[PDB]
Point group: C4
Chain length 387, copies 4
Amino acid sequence: TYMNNTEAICDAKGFAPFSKDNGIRIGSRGHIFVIREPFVSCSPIECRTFFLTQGSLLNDKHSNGTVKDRSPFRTLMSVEVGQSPNVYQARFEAVAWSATACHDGKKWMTVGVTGPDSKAVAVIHYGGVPTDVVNSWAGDILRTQESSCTCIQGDCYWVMTDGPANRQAQYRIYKANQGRIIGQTDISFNGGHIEECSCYPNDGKVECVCRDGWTGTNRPVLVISPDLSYRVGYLCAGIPSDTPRGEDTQFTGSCTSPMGNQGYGVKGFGFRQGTDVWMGRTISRTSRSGFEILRIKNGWTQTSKEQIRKQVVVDNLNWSGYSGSFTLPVELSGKDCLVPCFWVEMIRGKPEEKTIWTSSSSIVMCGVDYEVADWSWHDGAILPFDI
Amino acid sequence: TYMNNTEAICDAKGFAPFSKDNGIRIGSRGHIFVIREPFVSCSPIECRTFFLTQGSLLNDKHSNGTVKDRSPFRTLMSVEVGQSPNVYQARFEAVAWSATACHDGKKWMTVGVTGPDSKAVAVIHYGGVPTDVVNSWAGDILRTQESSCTCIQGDCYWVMTDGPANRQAQYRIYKANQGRIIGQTDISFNGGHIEECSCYPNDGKVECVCRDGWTGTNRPVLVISPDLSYRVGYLCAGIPSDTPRGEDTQFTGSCTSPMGNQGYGVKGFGFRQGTDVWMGRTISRTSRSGFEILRIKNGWTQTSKEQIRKQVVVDNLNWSGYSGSFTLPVELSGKDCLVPCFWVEMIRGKPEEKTIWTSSSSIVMCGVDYEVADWSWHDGAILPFDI
Amino acid sequence: TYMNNTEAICDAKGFAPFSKDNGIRIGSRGHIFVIREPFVSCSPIECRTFFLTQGSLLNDKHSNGTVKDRSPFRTLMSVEVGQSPNVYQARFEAVAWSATACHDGKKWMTVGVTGPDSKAVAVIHYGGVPTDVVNSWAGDILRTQESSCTCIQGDCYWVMTDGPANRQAQYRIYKANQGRIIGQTDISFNGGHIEECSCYPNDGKVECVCRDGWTGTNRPVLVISPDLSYRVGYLCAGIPSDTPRGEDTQFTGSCTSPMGNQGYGVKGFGFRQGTDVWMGRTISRTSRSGFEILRIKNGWTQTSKEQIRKQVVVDNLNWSGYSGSFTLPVELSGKDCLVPCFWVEMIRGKPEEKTIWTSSSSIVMCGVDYEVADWSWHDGAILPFDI
Amino acid sequence: TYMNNTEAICDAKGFAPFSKDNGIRIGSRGHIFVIREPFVSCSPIECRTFFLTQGSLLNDKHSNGTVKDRSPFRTLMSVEVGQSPNVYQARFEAVAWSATACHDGKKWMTVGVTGPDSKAVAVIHYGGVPTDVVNSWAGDILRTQESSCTCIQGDCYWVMTDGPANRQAQYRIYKANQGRIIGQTDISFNGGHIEECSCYPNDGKVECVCRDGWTGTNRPVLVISPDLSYRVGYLCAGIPSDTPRGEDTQFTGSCTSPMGNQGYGVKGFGFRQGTDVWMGRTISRTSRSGFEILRIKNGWTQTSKEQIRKQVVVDNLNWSGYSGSFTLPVELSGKDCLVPCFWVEMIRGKPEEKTIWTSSSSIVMCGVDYEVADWSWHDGAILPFDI
Ligand SMILES: CCC(CC)[C@H](NC(C)=O)[C@@H]1[C@H](O)[C@@H](C(=O)O)C[C@H]1NC(=N)N
Ligand SMILES: CCC(CC)[C@H](NC(C)=O)[C@@H]1[C@H](O)[C@@H](C(=O)O)C[C@H]1NC(=N)N
Ligand SMILES: CCC(CC)[C@H](NC(C)=O)[C@@H]1[C@H](O)[C@@H](C(=O)O)C[C@H]1NC(=N)N
Ligand SMILES: CCC(CC)[C@H](NC(C)=O)[C@@H]1[C@H](O)[C@@H](C(=O)O)C[C@H]1NC(=N)N
């Protein structure tokens, strides 16, 4: 029976730790896939941690240039949330250097993008077997979320990008049912840039917080209705949640356009709470270190900078990285609303550290009705490795 | 359907071995999590061994200061009772440096405590997803049992401590149903000290034998009714079952107050048998070595020192450590009463041995109608390791 | 309930990647069985990757003469498609240095051939237990497909060869139901040579594309009806799809006889598409390197050389090897026709490279309605190994 | 529902290979438990390989004196038949240096014997939890089968020995239902010696072929009826099937008394076939090397030495060892009779080879209606190891 994700996202006051895999630390002696871009998605029975392997393991010579983002050895795999991305407990999902996945109440759907940069192919899987495909439509690194996709009443949706990673690119919403594509839409966002959207279900619609690697330090936002009509813009909040970025005091929000000159960026997330917003970000404003989430009153609908809550999950003396959102299935939380949860990726190795490799572990946090105390659940690995 | 643990604890004459994981010995070459504080808990289908990892493996550099008790890398995981705490067979439970867990007949509930010492957070899980939380209420290492919690007719109970580990601290009983907290009580025990309670179901109530790390060498006791009313005191028996402690001859029992001057201590257990009591303890009275369990006639209700039975499980030439209780589900034992079972933790490494690490394995014993012969099922590992 | 594989094979325009195990690369540090001859077969619930181990692991001395094709240590095992052939996730199937396997809708059937070269024995398994046997009938390396067998409405069929690997040999079709042999037929093919047939279901009959290691560079073909009547010949197409072979321009097809002088060969596959054919082959015409599949119009019924589609899966700068076919169960693809899928084996080590061992990994591709772009999903391992 | 093992044992003409684990060869680099005494037993759904670990792994220092037969680190574990006794796929069964196990149609029952030599304890398990116990009754190494026990219509039976391993000892039959002992009988066999019985179901009764380590070179036999009445004697056959032993020509059989002077011995098996018998034995008559099984006409009821069939499974240039019997459940073989199957243990290391350790792998064979060709599926490991 299809999973009903039609409920509203629960209003949360704080965040509690769900899991921590300790992938790298274990990888010093255990058999762990060198990885990157991990994310969480849950079925009505369990939550899994998806990740992009590099076809090699930690502390092995094949972990050499594992910073190259894309290769034909890159594969999407999964384990139960909390377990390291070890070989022996892993489930194979798809061949990919970019991916997304989600359960529709009956089975798992995954989308792995691989192939050559100018004509990549996204293979859609459902039930452990390819079922449909999307070919590059702009011919320039067809890619996707790097976080959980969203399924509402049997239908699943996700966003893909194809084109430059700086100047204007192209963006689409895809809709599928049982692994078969049944709809797509072109997102008009002239001047705006969308990458690695972090999405979740809310009041029957798909809400995402993405990344603008062109000119904005504030994150793009889009609300997707099942029919495929949408709303694109930026997190109104007058606090920039991307990295790199500038000071908050010198920032001016906008729900319509990108602000700041900073070009690059990093995947991030955000949850709407009525008119408010829970927004995650690295503590360092120039680097991928530390991690905190702030709740801004009216932050979702106005250029507000009023902070009602702040919780640290990784201090600034430790490397962070990607971070995305997902929700707990009602069939597991017992609650009457979708529990918002996010994960934070913690990168170790190049380009910041003295190693031939690059990989990451993660920490997962979830909704909760109380305010939780600050702390640092960092990676903890001691670099460099025996190599 | 909920597990009925309303029956009385079976009267046992001796104890038979259930399992032995050989974690450390295997860990010399296999991929085993460095651990500490292991315990057993059973569902209607199987018994599992829960443990606190240190986010690292044996014979790896990350096992360095693994004696520090608390860190943000510490996680609660589980395996089927008897298997070593190896990476590839482990299930992730919670992020924690202190924990408890138990099955209610439908699912597993676990409680992991992590965070900073002054404002720690206990995340409650049910079904593999966080469901509720308890924040530090005394702001000084919020902690729990380190042994199986207790579920009776759908409701599960457990004890937590928050405050100093020497002088007076504070103690509470928590009650939950389906992962949602629905009750709590403050335990008044002025002059007494409660830590790491070992609990089990008996005649419809929760009975625990705990640890007084303040001034007592005899163990605190509390009988918890489902409504949350309780009874707190000490094991009446005139034989001190804590470590360190003094001679038995020079000991005077008390069901009301702590006796002896010895400050420190070690987690231990005890089972009521009508008016009698099966009490476990290290053979050495000053160190954590050896292990034996004694049955004292009328030992539960009087300052009795009459020994009717004595069985050794670990001789005094071998290191022991923690030990807790749990019961076999009627749906597995086929019996008509709850079969009492305990486990003994065997510590290797610091602070007693020449290693950079600290970890432990275990041996599990269970009820049984006959007297079992003495022996030593010790750890067996050859220290030091390649390091 | 029996799996209905009575439908026609879907008409495909291109092929999308299903999986890539990265077995060798992982094997540099992980615990991977040295293997050879891998293949895919699917049940109504999942697809598995079967393989022939050599009773040893990569980067271990026992991988020494692992090029010898046959030994008493060789065993057939399986894992879910996409996982490396690692120890801890493997299911034991049969003792064998030659094999075939397939699911009939209720259980898995496997056929492992082992024993001495002059009187080998094929043990048939069904449900994880031997059920029947076939003894060598020609007394000269009794062998089979090295690819998925075919089950139609409860009955499974496969082809075996017994006799010389150069000059004329003998060939048979075997039929079984629930692991019990219930039929066999002798294939008269005087002048022709059949080895390692790659088969699949089509319009209610078993269609195979095999290997002629005697004198032909074009592949033998046989259409098997459930009653055991058959049709034997060669892929009509005027393009030689075996290796080694000569130029295409200098080739003349034939649906009746072997063409070319080239003796040796390599396992390959082919799918009928109405009158057309999708045929796989190594790019190099002299060596086992690179891999591409071509669609020849009318290629199945005429000596046609008209290429309508060409897709590369492994470039010529990388080693390839065996390749076979299998189909997706309707109960997984949701489609109304059998989705054609193939796999390509990529050999590393002897006799082409500087290693004491020989093994291989694989890449799996599947049907799909669109044309997919060229690329190379090669092995990726860095030889030689620590040895 | 209880497994019906009331049928007669199928008449077999030859034996086909079921599995081969390659435990030692894999153990050169993989994580394999050093073991000894392996055996096979099947449930209505699968066959498993039980084994006695030594609490340590191959190629690790803890494998040092692993020849000592008994220690408190010895544990009984299992895996699916065919898989090596690796850490990550193993199920914990019991603490033991001697064991037996079998499925009754509903669950697994195992019996592990551990403790001190003078007062050992046999813990009986059913469903993964201890359920009953047997204490040493002679106080001298209480021990059991080292092979599969036998369950007929819900009841399981097995044989235990307690006393000297040379001169007269004591022997009993145990009967249990759902893990609870409900019967036992003393076997009067004055002058005879019974050890490690290999048993199987036949025409509703339990038939075993055991080992006389006192004075006989021929094997003891006992037919056990469910009511516990029995028949004890020796394999009538005039061919000695124990090791060491003397020439066959100089042997005189007896169904009543032990023959030959040879003292020691080795576990072996035998299947009745009407009046005939399939008997296994090492090829060497003085050492534990090679393995063959012979069918002797009328061999079960007369001092017959008429050989109708002979099949080799391990040549004399390779080490063998223990060997026991088990039967395939009708619910798996689809047949109408119990399929007889045996396993052969192959010892490597001390006392015959230059290693600090001792362990073994195995090969499993099964019934079958045809005669199978001779061959050698030996261990294949290259000793010594890195140590
Ligand atoms: C070129 C476009 C980039 C996205 C903004 C790039 N995406 C892909 C598919 O390569 C990401 C980016 O280079 C890396 C990062 O910013 O950390 C990860 C990297 N993502 C992945 N390797 N999956
Ligand atoms: C500071 C309070 C102590 C309890 C009496 C302390 N508990 C915690 C949560 O740190 C324990 C104690 O220091 C150690 C021991 O006595 O062996 C284990 C240690 N327990 C854990 N690391 N889980
Ligand atoms: C001698 C006949 C050959 C088939 C044409 C030979 N088959 C067997 C059972 O040994 C194959 C051949 O030598 C190897 C190859 O061509 O790659 C694989 C090899 N196949 C296997 N080892 N399973
Ligand atoms: C002392 C009695 C012996 C049986 C005849 C002895 N049994 C036990 C429980 O120790 C066996 C014997 O010494 C060894 C062998 O013959 O190979 C195995 C050994 N068996 C086991 N270690 N389980």
